[PDB]
Amino acid sequence: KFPRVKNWEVGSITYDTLSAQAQQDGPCTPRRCLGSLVFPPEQLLSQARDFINQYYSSIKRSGSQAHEQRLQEVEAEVAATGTYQLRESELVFGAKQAWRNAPRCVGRIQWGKLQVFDARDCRSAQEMFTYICNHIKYATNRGNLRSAITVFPQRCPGRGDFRIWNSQLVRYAGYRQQDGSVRGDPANVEITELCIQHGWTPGNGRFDVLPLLLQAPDEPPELFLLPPELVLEVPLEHPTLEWFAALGLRWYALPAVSNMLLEIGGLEFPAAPFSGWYMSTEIGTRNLCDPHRYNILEDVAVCMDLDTRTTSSLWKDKAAVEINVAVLHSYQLAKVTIVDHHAATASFMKHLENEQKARGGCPADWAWIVPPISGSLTPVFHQEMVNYFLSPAFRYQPDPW
Amino acid sequence: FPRVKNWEVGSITYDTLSAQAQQDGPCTPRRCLGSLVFPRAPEQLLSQARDFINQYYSSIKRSGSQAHEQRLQEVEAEVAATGTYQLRESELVFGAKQAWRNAPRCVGRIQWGKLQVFDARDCRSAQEMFTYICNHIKYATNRGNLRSAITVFPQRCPGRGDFRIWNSQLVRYAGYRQQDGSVRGDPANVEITELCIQHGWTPGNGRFDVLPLLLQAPDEPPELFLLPPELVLEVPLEHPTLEWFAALGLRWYALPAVSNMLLEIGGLEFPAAPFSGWYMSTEIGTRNLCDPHRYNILEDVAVCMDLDTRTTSSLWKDKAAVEINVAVLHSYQLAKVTIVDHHAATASFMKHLENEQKARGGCPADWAWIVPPISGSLTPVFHQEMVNYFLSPAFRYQPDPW
Ligand code: HEM
Ligand code: HEM
Ligand SMILES: Cc1cc(N)nc(CCc2cc(CCN)cc(F)c2F)c1
Ligand SMILES: Cc1cc(N)nc(CCc2cc(CCN)cc(F)c2F)c1
Numbered sequence: 001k002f003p004r005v006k007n008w009e010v011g012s013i014t015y016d017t018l019s020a021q022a023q024q025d026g027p028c029t030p031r032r033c034l035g036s037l038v039f040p041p042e043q044l045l046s047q048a049r050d051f052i053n054q055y056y057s058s059i060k061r062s063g064s065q066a067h068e069q070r071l072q073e074v075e076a077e078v079a080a081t082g083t084y085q086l087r088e089s090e091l092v093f094g095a096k097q098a099w100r101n102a103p104r105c106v107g108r109i110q111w112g113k114l115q116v117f118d119a120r121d122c123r124s125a126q127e128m129f130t131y132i133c134n135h136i137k138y139a140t141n142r143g144n145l146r147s148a149i150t151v152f153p154q155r156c157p158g159r160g161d162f163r164i165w166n167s168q169l170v171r172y173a174g175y176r177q178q179d180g181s182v183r184g185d186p187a188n189v190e191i192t193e194l195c196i197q198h199g200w201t202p203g204n205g206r207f208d209v210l211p212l213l214l215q216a217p218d219e220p221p222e223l224f225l226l227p228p229e230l231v232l233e234v235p236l237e238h239p240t241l242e243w244f245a246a247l248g249l250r251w252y253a254l255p256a257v258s259n260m261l262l263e264i265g266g267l268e269f270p271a272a273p274f275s276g277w278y279m280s281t282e283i284g285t286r287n288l289c290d291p292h293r294y295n296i297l298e299d300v301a302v303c304m305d306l307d308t309r310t311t312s313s314l315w316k317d318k319a320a321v322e323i324n325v326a327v328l329h330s331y332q333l334a335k336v337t338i339v340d341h342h343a344a345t346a347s348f349m350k351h352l353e354n355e356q357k358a359r360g361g362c363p364a365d366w367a368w369i370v371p372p373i374s375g376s377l378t379p380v381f382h383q384e385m386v387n388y389f390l391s392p393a394f395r396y397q398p399d400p401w
Numbered sequence: 402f403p404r405v406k407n408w409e410v411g412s413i414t415y416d417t418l419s420a421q422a423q424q425d426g427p428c429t430p431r432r433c434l435g436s437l438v439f440p441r442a443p444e445q446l447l448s449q450a451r452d453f454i455n456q457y458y459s460s461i462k463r464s465g466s467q468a469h470e471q472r473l474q475e476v477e478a479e480v481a482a483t484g485t486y487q488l489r490e491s492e493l494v495f496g497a498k499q500a501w502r503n504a505p506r507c508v509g510r511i512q513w514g515k516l517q518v519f520d521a522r523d524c525r526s527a528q529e530m531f532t533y534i535c536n537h538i539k540y541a542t543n544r545g546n547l548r549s550a551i552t553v554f555p556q557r558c559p560g561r562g563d564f565r566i567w568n569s570q571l572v573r574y575a576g577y578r579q580q581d582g583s584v585r586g587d588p589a590n591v592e593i594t595e596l597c598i599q600h601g602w603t604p605g606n607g608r609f610d611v612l613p614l615l616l617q618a619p620d621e622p623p624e625l626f627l628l629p630p631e632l633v634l635e636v637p638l639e640h641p642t643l644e645w646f647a648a649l650g651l652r653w654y655a656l657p658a659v660s661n662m663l664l665e666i667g668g669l670e671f672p673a674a675p676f677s678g679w680y681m682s683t684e685i686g687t688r689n690l691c692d693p694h695r696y697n698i699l700e701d702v703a704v705c706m707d708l709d710t711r712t713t714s715s716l717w718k719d720k721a722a723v724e725i726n727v728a729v730l731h732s733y734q735l736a737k738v739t740i741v742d743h744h745a746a747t748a749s750f751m752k753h754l755e756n757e758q759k760a761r762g763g764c765p766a767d768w769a770w771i772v773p774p775i776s777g778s779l780t781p782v783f784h785q786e787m788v789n790y791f792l793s794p795a796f797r798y799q800p801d802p803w
């Protein structure tokens with residue numbers, strides 16, 4: 001009843017004992033597997049107990065002293081208020097642990113080096129904006145990116161909620177026309193039309209950095225223009241394909257997810273923007289080449305004079321590899337931290353070994369860990385993985401409308 | 402009723418067919434084991450049989466008809482009398498085709514209805530088994546115009562051993578454990594190679610030595626059978642523009658013919674039912690040739706291409722891999738051997754999914770096996786969510802009979 005997990009490259013076997021702790025249930029049954037699907041009062045005490053018990057085992061402080069103490073304060077805090085506040089070190093530990101537990105994240109070898117800004121004493125979107133702006137400039141750090149999460153006030157009943165309406169802190173606009181097709185990023189068409197609805201002058205171009213829509217409790221969202229010198233971007237060029245620069249492609253330096261809901265010890269923070277640095281395939285494969293994204297694949301292939309007339313020339317494969325090469329090269333020349341999918345997945349294999357010794361396994365979503373190009377050329381492809389929900393966690397949440 | 406989105410188009414369907422998944426796999430609400438390579442009594446034989454006959458009679462527009470209950474009645478009487486029952490031939494052809502239709506890890510299922518079923522259930526020995534097999538290889542190879550085929554050897558039955566083909570495929574390359582602990586040839590085939598040797602095969606010492614067949618008649622030791630070289634159509638590998646690539650000496654064979662899986666139809670088990678189609682180029686170019694635990698040529702090709710193999714950010718692995726795949730497609734087209742690239746194959750599979758959504762209300766699909774091992778998000782199946790489940794009839798894995 002402890003899943004046997006095999007690696008088919010080496011032949012090594014481990015058992016995932018950690019899967020036994022799975023709190024929230026995922027989408028699969030003995031009947032059918034939905035692993036490939038993207039989006040599958042005082043029990044607050046039970047989650048808060050366990051998280052505090054985690055915290056203290058993590059500091060070699062199980063069964064002693066402040067463990068028992070802090071158990072009481074949360075007991076009394078919830079008893080009196082129907083909720084509780086996290087000790088600063090726990091909000092930090094919960095942030096680091098939710099990252100550690102993100103099955104779909106391949107960069108979790110870095111989970112232990114995360115900078116937590118505590119924005120829990122926030123009030124008004126004007127405040128978030130400078131909280132977000134500090135994060136952005138801290139995380140960006142002139143291109144030497146540093147993992148950062150800003151945690152805005154936890155949710156409480158009767159009162160509203162802090163939300164960033166954008167999926168990320170940096171998003172490119174997407175506009176329809178007298179023919180429907182999108183100039184710019186089609187993934188952001190909707191938040192782009194929202195930003196315009198809330199009175200933003202639309203740009204003309206394919207890489208217009210959207211403005212932020214920030215939402216203090218029970219107040220309508222407020223447009224915020226991001227300081228352009230705060231938004232570090234990388235114009236894309238290719239080392240040997242001199243014409244690639246002429247395609248005018250750019251991406252931003254900072255992958256900063258601003259629509260997910262941090263959950264620690266039963267507390268839900270609907271606004272907790274976390275950021276790290278990009279793996280190159282995210283930009284060069286998914287963002288630029290997905291058919292419903294910038295969809296530049298055939299354009300690059302035209303410019304490389306590839307045989308787009310037959311699938312078997314592998315023109316798609318060839319052009320995609322060069323786009324990724326241009327992403328990597330451009331980011332490295334701009335001295336912006338980026339990691340290629342080979343380095344990233346090799347570090348994740350190291351992570352799995354760490355976690356096997358540390359916690360006896362690791363929740364990992366195979367479909368999202370394996371890169372979107374050259375999958376079987378990365379060692380994670382040949383690694384069986386167990387996917388399950390551990391707490392604390394980053395969770396998906398409804399669009400705040 | 403699982404809702405299933407296509408992220409490239411925005412499509413949404415609900416897989417009503419998953420509710421019919423009888424046998425059960427490895428996942429729970431607690432944890433997903435989707436990525437596991439090997440997930441997994443007269444009355445129960447009766448209900449599998451009953452369901453399959455229901456299926457067969459559905460397919461012939463005769464559900465609930467006279468002949469339907471007669472067959473139901475017949476099967477129960479025969480399970481009562483013999484403990485088992487015999488498929489009619491039209492049922493066997495249907496069950497072989499459904500088994501393919503139901504195989505969740507087959508991206509080539511658009512072709513599931515075009516399948517040549519050879520009825521070898523009268524097979525009597527290993528020697529007759531070999532002859533049926535040679536004719537399978539001959540028919541399917543078809544001088545490089547490959548045709549999908551399956552040969553069904555006698556079903557498992559009380560009193561007698563199983564027919565087994567010990568080889569995992571009809572065409573395998575020898576893998577010799579070396580002097581210095583390495584492998585010469587295909588490392589995936591060390592075990593079967595060792596077995597062949599033990600059973601009297603005089604080994605070679607090349608990298609592409611075609612294996613003899615170990616063929617097991619019931620209650621018999623396996624028997625060694627060499628394949629006539631002229632029956633085994635191979636493809637020397639060259640690259641359309643890298644001319645040094647032909648000097649690698651690389652080959653692959655034309656016919657992918659899986660021979661160690663069990664065919665299950667209405668509760669009956671055929672532990673020997675080899676089946677064959679044609680390759681997708683990634684199976685050869687990416688997996689067979691570049692897997693570190695296989696031929697592992699990626700670095701030697703990238704070195705020959707003068708790629709910068711000292712840094713991973715140069716994407717030398719991706720680049721060498723793509724030209725190995727190019728080489729495979731070119732070489733098979735040049736040799737006039739049927740081959741489908743992963744873009745064509747995944748696009749035809751998208752049509753399979755649509756046909757299957759109209760026909761049955763969904764399609765069992767193992768996303769991690771359907772999505773090709775290079776250029777995954779470049780193919781449409783990447784952005785298609787899928788519901789993986791087990792339908793019968795089915796091809797199942799089975800333990801190696803040694
Ligand atoms: C520092 C380097 C990091 C790298 C290279 C990295 C890489 C990735 C990649 C490639 C994904 C794929 C999921 C997708 O494409 O949507 C992912 C998912 C994810 N990562 Fe990481 N990440 C990093 C840092 C972080 C940090 C700091 C956090 C949180 C504290 C985090 C939390 C997550 C979460 C929640 C997901 C799932 C998001 C989703 O499924 O949409 N990551 N990561
Ligand atoms: C005609 C062209 C065909 C194509 C292009 C094709 C393609 C594929 C591919 C690429 C895989 C994954 C293989 C792997 O990585 O292990 C696969 C799996 C499979 N195919 Fe098909 N196939 C074809 C014909 C057939 C036929 C005729 C049958 C049976 C009647 C069949 C049954 C299966 C089964 C059972 C699997 C899963 C077994 C396994 O791969 O572990 N296929 N197919
Ligand atoms: C911190 C971080 C670093 C990184 N390198 N990458 C990510 C994932 C970014 C992301 C992308 C998409 C696009 C569709 N997958 C959806 C998300 F929800 C999401 F968080 C997050
Ligand atoms: C009929 C058929 C056609 C085709 N084009 N391909 C196959 C798959 C061959 C195969 C390969 C491997 C290697 C590891 N995946 C394991 C299997 F179980 C298997 F059946 C079968």
Ligand SMILES: C[C@H](O)[C@H](O)[C@H]1CNc2nc(N)[nH]c(=O)c2N1
Binds near residue numbers: 038
């Ligand atoms: C349907 C399929 O599961 C979906 O497209 C997933 C697959 N794997 C992924 N992996 C990453 N990293 N990002 C994604 O958006 C997806 N999409």
Ligand SMILES: C[C@H](O)[C@H](O)[C@H]1CNc2nc(N)[nH]c(=O)c2N1
Binds near residue numbers: 382
């Ligand atoms: C461990 C992992 O499941 C394993 O490497 C799988 C992944 N997906 C695959 N998909 C296909 N088509 N063929 C394979 O051999 C594999 N191998």
Ligand SMILES: [Cl-]
Binds near residue numbers: 255282287
């Ligand atoms: Cl992104």
Ligand SMILES: [Cl-]
Binds near residue numbers: 657684689
């Ligand atoms: Cl193969």
Ligand SMILES: [Gd]
């Ligand atoms: Gd030109």
Ligand SMILES: [Gd]
Binds near residue numbers: 643
């Ligand atoms: Gd040349």
Ligand SMILES: [Zn+2]
Binds near residue numbers: 028032033034433435
């Ligand atoms: Zn599952």
